[PDB]
Design a protein around this nucleic acid. Structure first.
Ligand SMILES: O=P(O)(O)O[C@H]1[C@H](OP(=O)(O)O)[C@@H](OP(=O)(O)O)[C@H](OP(=O)(O)O)[C@@H](OP(=O)(O)O)[C@H]1OP(=O)(O)O
Ligand SMILES: [Zn+2]
Ligand SMILES: [Zn+2]
Lengths: 402, 140, 141, 290, 137, 54, 39, 211, 83
RNA sequence: GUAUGUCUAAAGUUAUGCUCUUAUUUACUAACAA
């Protein structure tokens, strides 16, 4: 079959179901024919019929199309199990039992059930064959197209409101600017970058702020609902769970940087007295310990190289498993390699960085999805990462030593 | 005698070997072509051809794989034909014939009287035939 | 829809019987003009007459042309529609045509419109018809 | 057939024990290629040739050309080659696999056509990938043994001989046009000698066609005979030509391989064929023996 | 380029198919409608142009420029009664827009049907319009 | 009169545009109310340290 | 290329369209009888 | 050769990046990176943030501003991003100032040509393909005309084949009027005008025929 | 300036362009044949064409006046710059 | 390799600064080989 042809020929669950029922019928009728055509004895017929009824599953993929027929099949199986073991008390094992009544009853009732269903189904089918399919298709909302529909409804509402507001009676092309503006605003909100376009009229800015708050509200609540759903362990779309992870991350970031803003806007949470007290405490502690502090690491160490080797090893541990690597990852690997090549030089570089570098490359993050609690994953830019490693290792060696 | 060219209605030209029946080169797509004629080019590198879009092209036929046009002969509203000897002379659909300097693509525009199938009397140096519609053959 | 319009059949066509018994299949065919379902009516003119007469066109179409639904002739004069339009064009005017759109979608659309065609406006109101007739007669002499 | 089936299943489960009863044609066993024994030799390299031409969309469009079924007999020098008319590709798609199938099909048909005496015993194949379907189409007759050559022989460049290519282009339909790949050589000397020369020639062609043709047409006074595929030379000038060709091959090796100077004898021989691979254990064997 | 009749017919068809197609997607792009109507005018088939205008009008009446364009198109071919009838219809539809009234007025003035311009002016003024209407009157 | 909305995200037509019109906000200035407390804090630390040190 | 919604599919056309006469799933008669109030 | 990205910002490269930013905006850093054969996405974005963005400033600090800076240092110890923000400057520059206070071309041209080519090419493959098909279609049409015209000249009249209609209700608009929505019924009489326009039409047709 | 004013002001203008230089009803048909001067309608037609032509050429001049990539963008940046 | 989309599949509708020669890059493409 050509792909087009193949597509055309995927006959639905009506036609196939019809075929299957006829297959069923064709079997038993054929068996009767055989019996009556002088081939097989009446006992053989009875057994044949029984076999057919108890193996409708195995003789005609009825279940394929309409799977609720498994119930019927199961019932038949049960009957067979019952019947046989009342039919084979003193009699041994073998195939020669007939007695097709109760199974036959089952199949009759299945047909009773389905006769309506097939009248509808095949009804519609042949109607389509004759009359074209209805060209007032209109699709319902479903989980799959809910969002798109929502958003279109929203932008229609917003657009309407703005037109109501706007006194000039502007053109649809001038509404494109409006709605596009809205879209940008939404994105800005998502980012947590304030959406302050200068040239607007205040009323419009108000209206859009409102509508994105509504949308935002819908979003956040939806996200929350999803996460409870995920916790429960319900049926949820892999894609949907990823979406929820994304949303919740953005939400988290927004929350976080809002907290930063808060911290800035009205001073640190720590009372200076409290801080002082803390300082006094810690000072007292080390005083009691005679704890000599960790120096800035010079060229003195016999351990320096050893220390370096640990950090590198640790870093390498990330990369030994995953053979396919990102660009950043590749860079990191290269750095590690070079460091092995040029240990002393690497050390020197590190030292220089420590002495000088107090502004670093920004840290990308993501959320690994433990389906209870999504965990933040900070990703430092490889060059600083080496420094961080070495410094860390050194600190631990010095701390534990001291 | 060996290599052989044949353009087509789909705007494609095909350099072939005499008998091989395997395209040495299909030409580019966004142009259009109608009349194929080789300029009596001293080196004999050149395969010229008229278009639908009022512009006769030139092609480096040696090698057959070469096909970069040097300079294009614009300004002859084409539904017709064109021929070379120095000069290329081709006629247009609407009005009249067009002599063109083969080196610079610009010369005199002689009146025809319509139709257009130009040719040169090759045994002489300067004599043309025009092919007008309905018994109007003009000679120069 | 509801069977609101009645069938528009002429006399000659239908035959000289005091009572015929015709049948109506509703939504019973696409018409011969506008490809559009309508109530197909049909009857044998006599009991033992072999030829059934079925209503070819739809009622809207019939009204539009102002014709019989079985004959395709004007309900007044029992003559070909084109011919009657020519006659009308000739007397009182220079141009009266009844252009059917030969494109399957547009024909439907045209049929839907409740608007008489060229000659149909004359032949609908009997006064105007009469006037046309007398003018025609005048033209003859 | 059943062995094929088991082997097929075995392949399906990636558990194929690489165990052959008959060893491959390596540079050592090259001698014992032929031994008063009716044979045939097959290459499927130039079955699916393509004109690369541009499209309206801008991407490449591959179109099939007429090809061949290089079907040689080293003893008689009778090169059969069924010229593949492009019509046979016009039927179907996925033509690289289909090339193999048509090849093996054609070969099988040919074998069927010939008598039980002239049904060739050991069939050698250039492309070891094309062996797999051949095995299938050789199931018609079980006596015809298959030989997967370890030594790659240049027969892609075989079709770049002038008259051959000419004939290929000429072909209008499903037809075969056999030739004697070497005629005068048979007349002068035994077949093996002829084959060595041929091998050299094809080798040179594979390295470079222009160089090859140049060597052949260095002298323009010499003329290629109407029947013969090659120019009929005198044996000393022939010798010279051969030497030149060899130099060409060595030159190529020097260029690409960058180690054509310090070659051992057997190794050198292998290099000429380009067949005895470094990883091939047969080579280790022969070497070990010496 | 556009030499013979049948060829011109084909051109007309193709162009229509383009225009029609673009209308199908955006029933409202009056720029597209009016452009199409201009095409009809250019073709010198007036009836089709009129039809286009009508359809366009139906699609969006409130777009005044469309009305104006239709009017002026009608004027172009000295089909003055059609212009007048249409303009009356425009007035009937959208009386409270002024430019339609003014368009009518100028048309009549150029026509030198001064009595009619008086009469219409009486009507317009009677509808308690803008002061502007009164002043112009 | 609404300004032609241009994004920092998504050009459909790929119109290049001025960099000022692209990137904006321009409101990092604040700096004043944020500091009220930090002075006290860092000063406190400095003084605390001094006290410890002496 | 791919564009926002502006002028909805207005059920004017769907009204003038011909009937289909298919039997959808939910238009099967569910809760035939109506309830009423005391009044 | 494939390799790990990095290096130094050549001025041409910087300019290219700026252009990209104008084009694609400040949040599609992948695309901009792609435009630069040497430099990464992250690198690019960082550069834009730090050096290249015009809504930064590199003007020297006033004495008051110096005071503000060093005071911030005193109070916020080496939290230089925060400090930078407070200043309203980029951070590296601020740090540098603080420190101060305390005391080949073929390749480049390749990427340029490619760059300019890209930036001046702002359509998805669907568009490009569509215009290609349009021009091809046009060409086909003219070729067809040339045949038809040729035959006419030759004396064989061939009617142009219709478009092979895609569906049963597909419309040819020259057959009959598209959807003749007639004018509003006539208050003022229109008969003479109808005649005149008809004549004009027929005359036009005649002219075309003669043309 | 509203479309109210711009109409009347354009009305006033074309009245200056004018200042440069019968009714018969069949009530049964409803057909109001206003037989008027055919020379004046022609003078309207030519004037109205000329007015539209003048405007048409006015854009053509203003289009041929001159941080962008294509025809549209240049104008789109011009739509931003006017603000 | 595909969805998919075009194409063909035969009967005649009655009118009178440049050209050139080459070698090299880079890019893209390629069910073509490795
Ligand atoms: O239990 P099921 O999966 O439905 O299979 C049963 C079952 O076979 P198993 O016990 O091997 O599964 C019966 O065996 P008993 O339990 O009765 O020993 C056997 O019945 P008979 O012994 O009477 O043959 C019958 O076989 P049959 O259908 O031939 O009656 C067979 O059903 P399947 O053959 O469909 O598995
Ligand atoms: Zn009748
Ligand atoms: Zn009808």
């Amino acid at each position: 079959l050509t792909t087009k042809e193949r597509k055309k020929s995927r006959l639905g669950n009506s036609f196939h179901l019809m075929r299957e029922l006829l297959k069923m019928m064709k079997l038993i009728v054929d068996t009767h024919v055989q019996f009556r055509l002088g081939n097989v004895d009446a006992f053989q017929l009875a057994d044949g019929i029984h076999y057919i009824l108890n193996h409708i599953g195995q003789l005609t993929g009825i279940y394929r199309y309409k799977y609720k027929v498994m119930h019927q099949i199961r019932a038949c199986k049960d009957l067979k199990h019952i019947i046989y073991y009342k039919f084979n008390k003193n009699l041994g094992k073998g195939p020669g039992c007939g007695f097709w009544q109760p199974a036959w009853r089952v199949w009759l009732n299945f047909l009773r059930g389905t006769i309506p269903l097939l009248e509808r189904y095949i009804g519609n089918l042949i109607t389509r064959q004759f009359e074209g399919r209805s060209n007032e298709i209109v699709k319902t909302t479903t989980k799959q197209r809910l969002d798109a529909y929502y958003d279109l409804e929203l932008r229609n509402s917003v657009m309407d409101d703005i037109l109501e507001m706007m006194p000039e009676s502007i053109r649809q092309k001038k509404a494109r600017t409006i709605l596009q503006h809205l879209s940008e605003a939404w994105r800005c909100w998502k980012a947590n970058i304030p959406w302050d376009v200068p040239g607007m009229p205040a009323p419009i800015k108000k209206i859009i702020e409102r509508y994105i708050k509504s949308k935002a509200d819908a979003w956040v609540s939806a996200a929350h609902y999803n996460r409870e759903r995920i916790k429960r362990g319900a049926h949820v779309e892999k894609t949907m769970v990823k979406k929820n992870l994304g949303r919740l991350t953005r939400l988290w970031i927004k929350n976080e940087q809002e907290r930063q803003r808060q911290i800035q806007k009205n001073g640190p949470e720590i009372t200076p007295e409290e801080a002082t007290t803390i300082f006094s405490v810690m000072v007292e502690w080390l005083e009691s310990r005679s704890f000599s502090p960790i120096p800035f690491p010079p060229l003195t160490y016999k351990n320096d190289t050893k220390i370096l080797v640990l950090a590198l090893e640790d870093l390498k541990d990330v990369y030994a498993s995953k053979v396919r690597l990102n660009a950043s990852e590749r860079e990191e690997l290269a750095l590690i390699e070079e460091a092995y090549d040029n240990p002393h030089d690497t050390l020197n570089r590190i030292k220089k960085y420590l002495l000088t570098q107090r502004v670093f490359k920004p840290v990308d993050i993501t959320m690994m999805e433990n389906y209870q609690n999504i965990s933040p994953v900070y990703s430092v830019d490889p060059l600083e990462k080496i420094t961080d490693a070495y410094l860390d290792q050194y600190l631990w060696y010095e701390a534990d030593q001291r | 005698g060996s290599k052989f060219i044949s353009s087509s209605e789909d705007k494609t030209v095909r350099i072939w070997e005499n008998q091989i029946n395997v395209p040495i080169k299909q030409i580019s797509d966004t142009a259009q072509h109608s009349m194929p004629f080789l300029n009596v080019h001293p080196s004999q590198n050149y395969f010229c051809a008229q278009s639908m879009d009022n512009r006769i092209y030139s092609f480096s036929l040696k090698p057959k794989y070469k096909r970069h046009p040097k300079k294009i002969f614009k300004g002859h509203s084409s539904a017709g034909y064109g021929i070379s000897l120095r000069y290329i002379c081709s006629g247009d659909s609407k009005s009249r014939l067009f002599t063109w300097d083969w080196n610079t693509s610009r010369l005199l525009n002689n009146i025809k009287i319509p139709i257009t199938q130009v040719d040169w009397h090759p045994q002489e140096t300067s004599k043309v035939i025009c092919s007008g519609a309905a018994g109007k053959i003009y000679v120069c | 829809e509801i069977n609101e319009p009645p069938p528009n059949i002429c006399e000659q066509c239908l035959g000289d019987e005091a009572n015929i018994r015709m049948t109506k299949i509703p939504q019973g065919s696409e018409c011969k003009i506008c490809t559009l379902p309508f109530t197909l009516y049909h009857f044998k003119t006599s009991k033992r007459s072999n030829n059934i007469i079925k209503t070819l066109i739809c009622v809207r179409c019939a009204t539009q042309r102002n014709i019989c639904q079985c004959c395709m002739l004007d309900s007044r004069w029992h003559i070909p529609i084109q011919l009657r339009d020519h006659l009308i064009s000739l007397v009182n005017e220079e141009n009266v045509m009844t252009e059917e759109a030969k494109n399957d979608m547009m024909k439907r659309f045209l049929s839907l419109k409740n608007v008489k065609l060229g000659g149909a406006q004359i032949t609908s109101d009997p006064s105007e018809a009469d006037n046309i007739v007398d003018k025609l007669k005048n033209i003859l002499l | 057939a059943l062995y094929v089936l088991r082997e097929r299943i075995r392949k399906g489960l990636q558990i194929y024990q690489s165990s052959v009863q008959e060893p491959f044609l390596n540079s050592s066993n090259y001698a014992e290629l032929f031994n008063n024994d009716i044979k045939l030799f097959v290459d499927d390299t130039n079955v699916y040739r393509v004109t690369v031409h541009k499209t309206f969309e801008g991407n490449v469009a591959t179109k099939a050309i007429n090809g061949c079924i290089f079907t040689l007999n080293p003893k008689t020098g009778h090169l059969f080659l069924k010229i593949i008319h492009t019509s046979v590709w016009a039927g179907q798609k996925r033509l690289s696999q289909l090339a193999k199938w048509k090849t093996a099909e054609e070969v099988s048909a040919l074998v069927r056509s010939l008598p039980k005496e002239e049904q060739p015993k050991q069939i050698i194949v250039t492309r070891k990938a094309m062996l797999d379907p051949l095995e299938v189409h050789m199931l018609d007759f079980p006596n015809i043994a298959i030989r997967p050559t370890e030594l790659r022989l240049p027969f892609s460049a075989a079709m770049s001989i002038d008259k051959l290519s000419d004939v290929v282009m000429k072909a209008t339909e499903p037809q075969m046009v056999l030739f004697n790949i070497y005629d005068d050589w048979l007349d002068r000397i035994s077949s093996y000698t002829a084959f060595s020369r041929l091998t050299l020639l094809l080798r040179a062609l594979k390295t470079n066609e222009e160089s090859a043709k140049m060597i052949l047409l260095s002298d323009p006074t010499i003329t290629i005979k109407s029947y013969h595929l090659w120019p009929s030379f005198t044996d000393e000038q022939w010798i010279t030509i051969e030497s030149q060709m060899r130099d060409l091959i060595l030159t190529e090796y020097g260029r690409k391989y960058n180690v054509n100077i310090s070659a051992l004898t057997q190794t050198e021989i292998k290099d000429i064929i380009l067949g005895q691979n470094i990883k091939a254990p047969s080579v280790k064997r022969q070497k070990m023996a010496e | 380029d556009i030499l013979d009749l049948e060829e011109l017919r084909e051109y007309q068809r193709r162009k229509r198919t383009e225009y029609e197609g673009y209308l199908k997607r955006n029933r409202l792009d009056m720029g597209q409608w009016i452009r199409y109507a201009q095409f009809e005018i250019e073709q010198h088939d007036m009836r089709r142009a009129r039809s286009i205008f009508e359809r366009a009008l139906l699609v969006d009446s409130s777009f005044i420029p469309l009305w104006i364009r239709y009017i002026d198109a009608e004027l172009k071919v000295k089909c003055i009664n059609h212009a007048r009838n249409l303009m009356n219809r425009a007035i009937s539809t959208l009386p409270r827009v002024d430019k339609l009234w003014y368009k009518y007025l100028i048309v009549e003035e150029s026509l030198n049907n001064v009595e009619i311009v008086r009469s219409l002016y009486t009507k317009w003024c009677s509808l308690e319009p803008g002061v502007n209407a009164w002043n112009s009157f | 009169k609404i300004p032609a909305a241009v994004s920092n995200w998504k050009n459909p037509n790929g119109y290049t545009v001025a960099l000022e019109r692209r990137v904006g906000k321009a409101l990092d200035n604040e700096n004043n109310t944020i500091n009220d407390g930090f002075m006290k804090l860092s000063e406190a630390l400095e003084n605390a340290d001094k006290k410890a040190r002496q | 290329s791919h564009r926002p919604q502006l002028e909805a599919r207005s059920g004017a056309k769907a009204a003038a369209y011909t009937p289909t006469g298919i039997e959808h799933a939910r238009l099967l008669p569910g809760h035939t009888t109506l309830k009423y109030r005391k009044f | 050769p494939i390799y790990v990205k990095g290096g130094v910002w050549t001025n041409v490269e910087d300019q290219i990046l700026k252009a990209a930013v104008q084009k694609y905006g400040t949040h599609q850093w992948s695309k901009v990176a792609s435009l630069l054969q040497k430099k990464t996405a992250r690198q690019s974005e960082l550069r834009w943030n730090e050096y290249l963005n015009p809504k930064l400033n590199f003007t020297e600090f006033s004495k008051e501003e110096d005071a503000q800076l060093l005071d911030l240092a005193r109070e916020l110890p080496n939290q230089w991003r925060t400090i930078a923000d407070m200043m309203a400057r980029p951070a590296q520059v601020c740090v540098e100032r603080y420190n101060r206070l305390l005391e080949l071309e073929d390749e480049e041209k390749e990427m340029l040509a490619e760059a300019r080519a890209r930036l001046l090419n702002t359509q998805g493959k669907k568009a490009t393909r569509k215009i290609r098909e349009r021009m091809l279609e046009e060409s086909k049409r003219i070729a067809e005309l040339q045949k038809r015209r040729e035959l006419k000249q030759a004396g064989i009249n061939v009617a142009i084949k219709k478009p092979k209609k895609k569906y049963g209700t597909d419309i040819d608009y020259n057959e009959d009027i598209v959807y003749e929505q007639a004018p509003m019924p006539g208050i003022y009489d229109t008969s003479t005008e109808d005649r005149q326009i008809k004549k004009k039409f027929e005359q036009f047709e005649r002219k075309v025929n003669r043309k | 300036i509203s479309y109210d004013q711009l109409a009347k002001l354009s009305y006033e203008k074309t009245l200056r362009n004018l200042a440069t230089q019968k009714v018969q009803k069949d009530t049964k048909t409803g057909k109001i044949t206003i037989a008027d001067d055919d020379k004046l309608v022609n003078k309207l037609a030519v004037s109205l064409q000329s007015e539209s032509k003048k405007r048409y050429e006015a854009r053509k001049r203003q289009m041929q006046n001159a941080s962008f990539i294509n025809d549209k963008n240049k104008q789109f940046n011009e739509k931003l710059s006017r603000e």
